[PDB]
Design a protein around this ligand. Structure first.
Ligand SMILES: CC(C)CCC[C@@H](C)[C@H]1CC[C@H]2[C@@H]3CC=C4C[C@@H](OC(=O)CCC(=O)O)CC[C@]4(C)[C@H]3CC[C@]12C
Ligand code: BEF
Ligand SMILES: [Mg+2]
Length: 1032
């Protein structure tokens, strides 16, 4: 149930709300976004539903919808339109206005719709368009750009402004704002580009009363219009009901079925028309018409029934506009960092109190804990990392309007694949022709054009009812595919060879839905007599041939072909004793030519795998990523595609699970059907999955773990399957191209859309090519992005702790680092490094091992502690080595910083730490397995080299920036070379530590604490099934 609350508005109250939400703070905007009821109570006063300009909809979950007007008030909730009915005082959806009208009403609507009625119904129903509104820059900002670390950055900016660091807070604010605005611009431009490649309209012909017609746009279509369908077919603009002629539709975009569907004219009657009862007669929006043929009249008419979001495709894409729910692994890491930073802050407060500095300085340093935990350039570094990942994906043709979900691509353990249009082509392609030699079959010939010039070749070429329209063959889709395969050229009719004799059709018997076959009579120069061909259903066509021409294994071979989802159509022929002339061959009755045939062969049609599918599936199976086929097609085609695709290896068992509906007196039962030709896969249909979910809730986890083929699977069942897999703690990806996959793509963690319609403009990922090559690309980019994010976080931690240790060592001496030294270290070094280190691309190939999913790892913490030990050792060694020199004179301990600068202690500590900030940057930037080698990042190499050169110039060149940076000029060149030597030892030690840890720590962890269990539910289920398989 839902409740609609009305809220009118007043100008003074609106301006008051605006000023109190803008001039006061930005916090009220986010608070109102968290709870819209407070915002609507503050801005809008309660009113009556008949006078409301606003509705609050809870279904509780609260949505605020404005009440638009066209004296026709309405509102749009998740796409659906709810007009305000003025006689019953409610907002009734427009979907309910055509309810109850019968088939006679639909047939009376075949004379078009008058213009005045057209405008009335366009006001009522709106445009015939599935339009998803663009997210504005504020909403895009909140959902994408902001991070919880920007709150820390805002607090630190407030702290800086409190302690009067204007040229530092301003620079940090500029960097963060530029990163945020550039990311918003990139995401907005990608969304606009996605929505510019979707064609929301066509030029459709509509009947108009009075015998006239008019070519209107596809958006002017309203329920009641009578479309005139073109004979060449094309995409369907809306949901209609055939009232004249019949169509041949390819509904693979809505249902996933690859076999073309024959839609027939709606039958006249008093019963109410229903899109489910009369689905055999309805044309659905988004489906492709392959052939529109009319018996009576010169046009194929289809009365429009639903337009816009009330269509089937509109209903499918409307269910994903419902809002439903990345940093939790990093907040634990920053809390672990905060423990160390708090210990250091306690030490700093104690050692500053011993120095008797003002208490305000002490409390400012205490509050500096937040800046220590979250560095100033951490949010900017993360935003730039996501920007680099998004740009790298876009340069490959993949649109990512949710850059925060790129890291989820590196966590994927399972990928669900649609079959029709994603793994295979949309329709049926010619598998081959099976000739006959003597009395028995011959091996299948994949290319019928390679056949000799015999009866079978001419039967494949000429036995059809094709026509020429705009220099292209127009007719039955299977006939089109057969003639394309045979290579012959269409020009009663004449056919020229692909490069023999051009045979000419002398007569043609039309294809009938009762006889399930068609016949032609052809002749060619140099022949003794005409030759009549027959093409149709193999079972009944073979019933016309001679018993000595049909092989004894005909039924077995037909069963073998039709058990794999193939569309077999038989061909037959017979020499005709008729004279080769049109005076007699045009008067031949069908019954004489249909009898005493000779089976020439079979023509196998199959749903063809795309060439880019098998390598990708084998690649995913090599890296131990589960491949699951989630299709709306039948079980035989799905199983055949899985077996020939790589999801099921030829040596791996496949089990069909068949759930029986519980009838009266019996309960639901599961029976498993093992077939011939993870080593144990499960195949099951949609109804079987639905019965297993509700009647066998304990066996559902085992089905989900072992199942690999899910056929006849409804869109709601697809998204339910994705959700159930995610309940097993899977990270489920999904690749789809149809409207049936929208719910699965939205519910999945990484949903890549191959669609060219409005389903793509709201998907996280959208590939520009119609293959699944994007899936390995997305996974590689996700692994690279996860590795880069972990490297950035580790570098920020190492930086913060290095600077904190340096500052503590200086505080113990009653010294500080220095304002301009702080500015150099942060802005010039760490901001540059964090920006340019996120630029390294993904590795060329996928790997078996995934990147770690948590920042609190024994490897990560151990590496951080060892690098900190090395850094602290180097800095303290430099300090205690400066303290043992003849030229060294101690600082003036009486005065405090920054007045005791320049001195030797600060100079040495800054000299060592500045090199450490680059060493710890080159160290955490790891390449393989998940990233390219470091040296491929030319900007980052150049930045590191230039900064190292600058720091070596500071160390060695006498008088270079020793004044600005408040450094002290050292005259002992031996000490300068010894400091450089300490820097080199730190460099080699950091790299050796990283290599030794990365190569020997997992082995040490395995040997010390043997992890004999896992917490992921699917892994425990896999262990349990390995110990005891569920189907014995
Ligand atoms: C207050 C005064 C006296 C101090 C001046 C300090 C500047 C030298 C700092 C401030 C911000 C720093 C910048 C911070 C960010 C970057 C990003 C980086 O450029 C890119 O990000 C391009 C990325 C690509 O190659 O695609 C180059 C270094 C740079 C400009 C830094 C160069 C040094 C800058 C200009
Ligand atoms: F397009 Be899929 F087979 F649902
Ligand atoms: Mg599809």
């Amino acid at each position: 149930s839902v409740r609609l609350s009305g809220y009118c508005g007043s100008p003074w109250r609106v301006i008051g709300y605006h000023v109190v939400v803008w001039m006061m703070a930005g916090i009220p905007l986010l608070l109102f976004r968290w709870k819209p009821l407070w915002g609507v109570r503050l801005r809008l006063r309660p009113c009556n539903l008949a006078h409301a300009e606003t509705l609050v909809i809870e279904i509780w979950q609260l949505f605020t919808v404005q009440v638009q007007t066209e004296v026709l008030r309405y509102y749009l909730f998740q796409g659906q339109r709810y007009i305000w009915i003025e006689t019953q005082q409610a907002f009734y959806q427009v979907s309910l206005l055509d309810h109850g009208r019968s088939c006679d009403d639909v047939h009376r609507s075949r004379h078009g719709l008058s213009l005045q009625d057209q405008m009335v119904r366009k006001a009522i129903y709106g445009p015939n368009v599935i339009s998803i509104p663009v997210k504005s820059y504020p909403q895009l900002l909140v959902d994408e750009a902001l991070n919880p670390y920007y709150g820390f950055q805002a607090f630190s900016i407030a702290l800086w402004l409190a302690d009067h660091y204007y040229w530092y807070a301003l620079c940090i604010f500029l960097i963060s704002s530029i990163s945020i605005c550039l990311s918003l611009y990139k995401t907005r431009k990608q969304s606009q580009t996605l929505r510019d490649m979707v064609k929301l309209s066509m030029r459709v012909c509509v009947c108009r009363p009075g015998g006239e017609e008019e070519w209107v746009d596809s958006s002017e279509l309203v329920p009641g219009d009578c479309l005139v369908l073109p004979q060449e077919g094309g995409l369907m603009p809306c949901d209609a009901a055939l009232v004249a002629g019949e169509c041949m539709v390819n509904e693979s975009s809505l249902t996933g079925e690859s076999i073309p569907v024959l839609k027939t004219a709606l039958p006249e009657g008093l019963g109410p028309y229903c899109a489910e009862t009369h689905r055999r007669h309805t044309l659905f929006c988004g489906t492709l018409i392959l052939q529109a043929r009319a018996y009576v009249g010169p046009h194929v008419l289809a009365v429009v029934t639903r337009t816009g979001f009330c269509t089937a495709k509109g209903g499918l894409v409307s269910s994903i506009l419902h809002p439903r729910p990345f940093y939790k692994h990093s907040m634990k890491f920053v809390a672990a960092l905060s423990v160390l930073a708090l210990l250091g802050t306690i030490y700093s407060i104690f050692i500053l109190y011993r120095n008797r500095v003002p208490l305000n300085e002490i409390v400012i340093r205490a509050l500096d804990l937040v800046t220590v935990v979250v560095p100033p350039a951490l949010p900017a570094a993360m935003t730039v990392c996501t920007l680099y990942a998004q740009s790298r994906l876009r340069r490959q043709g993949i649109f990512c309007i949710h850059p925060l979900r790129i890291n989820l691509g590196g966590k994927l353990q399972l990928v669900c694949f649609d079959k029709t249009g994603t793994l295979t082509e949309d329709g049926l392609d010619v598998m081959g022709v099976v000739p006959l030699k003597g009395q028995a079959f011959l091996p299948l010939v994949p290319e019928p054009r390679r056949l000799p010039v015999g009866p079978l070749l001419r039967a494949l070429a000429t036995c059809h009812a094709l026509s020429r329209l705009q220099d292209t063959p127009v007719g039955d889709p299977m006939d089109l595919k057969m003639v394309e395969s045979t290579g012959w050229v269409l020009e009663d009719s004449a056919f020229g060879t692909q490069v023999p004799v051009p045979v000419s059709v002398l007569h043609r018997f039309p294809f009938s839905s009762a006889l399930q076959r068609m016949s032609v009579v052809v002749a060619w120069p140099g022949a003794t007599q005409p030759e009549a061909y027959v093409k149709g259903s193999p079972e009944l066509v073979a019933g016309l041939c001679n018993p000595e021409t049909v092989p004894t294994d005909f039924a077995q071979m037909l069963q073998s072909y039709t058990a794999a989802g193939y569309r077999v159509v038989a061909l037959a022929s017979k020499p005709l004793p008729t004279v080769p002339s049109l005076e007699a061959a045009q008067q031949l009755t069908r019954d004489t030519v249909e009898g005493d045939l000779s089976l020439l062969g079979l023509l196998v049609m199959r749903n063809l795998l795309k060439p880019q599918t098998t390598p990708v599936i084998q690649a995913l199976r090599r890296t131990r990523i589960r491949a699951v086929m989630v299709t709306g097609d039948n079980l035989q085609t799905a199983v055949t595609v899985a077996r020939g695709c790589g999801m099921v290896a030829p040596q791996e068992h496949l089990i069909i699970v068949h759930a029986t509906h519980p009838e009266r007196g019996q309960p639901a039962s599961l029976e498993f059907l093992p077939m011939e030709s993870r080593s144990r896969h499960l195949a099951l249909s949609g109804p079987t999955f639905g019965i297993i979910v509700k009647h066998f809730p304990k066996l559902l986890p085992k089905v989900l773990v072992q199942g690999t083929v899910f056929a006849r699977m409804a869109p709601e069942q697809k998204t339910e399957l994705v959700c159930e897999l995610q309940k097993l703690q899977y990270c489920v990806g999904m690749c789809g191209d149809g409207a049936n996959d929208c719910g699965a793509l939205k519910a999945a963690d990484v949903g890549i859309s191959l669609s060219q319609a409005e389903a793509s403009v709201v998907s996280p990922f959208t590939s520009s090519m119609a293959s699944i090559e994007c899936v390995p690309m997305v996974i590689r980019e996700g692994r690279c992005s996860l590795d880069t994010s972990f490297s950035v976080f580790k570098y920020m931690a190492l930086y913060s702790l290095t600077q904190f240790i340096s500052v503590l060592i200086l505080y113990t001496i009653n010294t500080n680092l220095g304002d301009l030294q702080f500015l150099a270290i942060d802005l010039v070094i760490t901001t540059t490094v964090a920006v340019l280190m996120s630029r390294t691309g993904p590795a060329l190939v996928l790997g078996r091992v995934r990147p770690p999913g948590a920042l609190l790892s024994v490897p990560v913490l151990s590496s951080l502690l060892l690098q900190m030990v090395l850094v602290t050792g180097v800095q303290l060694g430099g300090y205690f080595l400066t303290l043992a020199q003849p030229w060294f004179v101690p600082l003036n301990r009486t005065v405090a910083a920054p007045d005791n600068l320049p001195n030797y202690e600060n100079t040495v500590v800054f000299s060592l730490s500045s090199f450490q900030y680059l060493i710890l940057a080159a160290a955490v930037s790891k390449g393989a397995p998940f990233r390219r080698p470091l040296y491929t990042n030319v900007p980052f190499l150049v930045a590191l080299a230039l900064l190292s050169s600058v720091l070596v110039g500071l160390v060695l060149v006498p008088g270079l920036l020793q004044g600005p940076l408040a450094l002290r000029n050292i005259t002992d060149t031996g000490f300068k070379l010894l400091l450089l030597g300490l820097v080199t030892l730190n460099f080699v030690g950091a790299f050796m530590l990283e290599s030794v840890l990365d190569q020997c720590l997992p082995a040490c962890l395995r040997r010390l604490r043997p992890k004999r269990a896992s917490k992921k539910r699917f892994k425990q289920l896999e262990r349990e099934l390995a110990e005891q398989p569920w189907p014995p």
